[PDB]
Design a protein around this ligand. Sequence first.
Ligand SMILES: N[C@@H](CCC(=O)N[C@@H](CS)C(=O)NCC(=O)O)C(=O)O
Ligand SMILES: N[C@@H](CCC(=O)N[C@@H](CS)C(=O)NCC(=O)O)C(=O)O
Lengths: 223, 224
Amino acid sequence: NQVKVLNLWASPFGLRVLVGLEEKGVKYEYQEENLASKSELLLKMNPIHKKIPVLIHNDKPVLESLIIVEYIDEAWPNTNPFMPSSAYERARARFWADFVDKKLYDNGGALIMKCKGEAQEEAKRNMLEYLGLLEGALDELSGGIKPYFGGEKFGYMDIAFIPFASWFQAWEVMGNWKIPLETQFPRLHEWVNACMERESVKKVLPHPEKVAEFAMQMRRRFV
Amino acid sequence: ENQVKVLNLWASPFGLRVLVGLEEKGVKYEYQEENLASKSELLLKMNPIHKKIPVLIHNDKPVLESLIIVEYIDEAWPNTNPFMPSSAYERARARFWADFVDKKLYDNGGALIMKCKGEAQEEAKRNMLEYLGLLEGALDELSGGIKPYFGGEKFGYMDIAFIPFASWFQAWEVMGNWKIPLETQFPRLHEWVNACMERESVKKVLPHPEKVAEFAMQMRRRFV
Ligand SMILES: N[C@@H](CCC(=O)N[C@@H](CS)C(=O)NCC(=O)O)C(=O)O
Ligand SMILES: N[C@@H](CCC(=O)N[C@@H](CS)C(=O)NCC(=O)O)C(=O)O
C-alpha cells in the first residue's frame, strides 16, 4: 500500500497520525521503531530530527505530527474535514495544538516524567493551569456546541489532543496524585468519554496502564 | 482608523514576517512598537498566555505565533497573493522548513551566537553553516530548480518566514566575529536574498542590518 507509518506505540504525537488516518478511512502499514536502535529507514526519512512519527506517502516522508495532520486533511480533502472553514478559527486551532505540545506536554507532563520534588509539584501546578486553559479552549472552539473541539465534528484539535488521555494515568502515577478532570475540568472529561466512542480512537489508542508502566520505566532513566 | 493593527518589536524577524506578508497582500495596517520591559495592556489582553510579539489584530481578532499569522494572512486575503503552494506535500515541506528556520537556524544557531561564548559559540556557528547548507538545499527542493524564490517565481510562505533573518546575518557575524560565506558556499541563498530585497515589501519593512547588529550586541552584552 501507498501509505506507511513509522511510530512508537505510546507516542501521542504519532497516535495523532494514526487517529487522523483512520478518520479519513485510509488503510496503512505500521512499523514500530525502537528509538534505542532506529531503522535506517527512519534515519533516511527523518535525518534531521531522527524522530517519530513519520508518515510515508508514496515513499515521500511527511514529518512533524501537526503538519502531518494538516497534510492528511489536505491529502484526503474530499471527506472528514479536520480544519475549520474560517481562517481565524484555524489560527486558534493551530494555536491550541501548539499549546498542547509546548505547554501541557513540554512544560507539564514531560517534567512530571523527568522531575522530582518542588520542580514536579510546579509541573503539576502548570498542568492544571494548562488543562484549565484547554477546558476553556474547548468551549471557545466548540462555540459551546458539544462534545468536540469542533462541536459536533471531530477535528484537528480533537486529534492533536485526545492521545494524551492515554497518558493521564501515567502522569497520575509518576506524580503520585489524582488529576481532577471530572470536577475541575468536566468538559474535557465528557470530551474524552465522547472521543472514546469513535472507532478510530478505540482502534489505535493503547491502554493507560501499559503507558504508565512504560512511563515509569522511562522515569527511572531520569531521577 | 484602519482595521489591522500589529503589535511588534522592530528588530524581531518573527514580526517582520507578519509585516512582509501584510505588505504583499496590500493590506494597510497600524503599527505599534512594544517595549518588552513595559508591555502594553493590549498585548496582555490579546496574548495573555505568551505575552509575546508579534500580535496581529484583525477586526478585534488576535492572531498569535508568526507562522500561524502568516498562514492566517494568506487564508484571510486569499484572492490576492497566494503564499502557500498548490500541493499538500510541498506545503508540508514548506511548513517543515519554516519550523526548521525557527528551531534550528535560530534557536540552535543564531540565538546561541548571541547568548554563548567560546566552544559553545563555535559549535553554534558550525551548526549555522550546517543548517544553511540544508536550507540551500531547501530552496532548490521547493523551487524545482526554478529561480529565484522558494516558490520559484512566486514569493511565498517560506520566503516570508526566512527573509527577515537576512537582516540578522551581519549581527551574527559580528557577535561571532566571523563571516557567513553565502556568496561562495550558499550562492542560491545569496541570489535569493538579493532578489527578495528588490521587492517593495521587504525594502519597506526590513531594517538596516547595522542597527540590528548594534541592538544584538547590546543584548549580547546583557548576556555576555
Ligand atoms: N516534534 C514532533 C515530536 C515527536 C516526538 O519527539 N515524539 C517522541 C515521543 S516521546 C519521540 O519518540 N521522539 C523521537 C526521539 O526520541 O528522538 C511532533 O510534533 O510530532
Ligand atoms: N508569537 C511569536 C513568538 C515569537 C517570540 O518569541 N518573539 C519574541 C521577540 S523575538 C518575544 O516576543 N519576546 C518577548 C520577551 O522576551 O519577553 C511568534 O510569532 O513566533
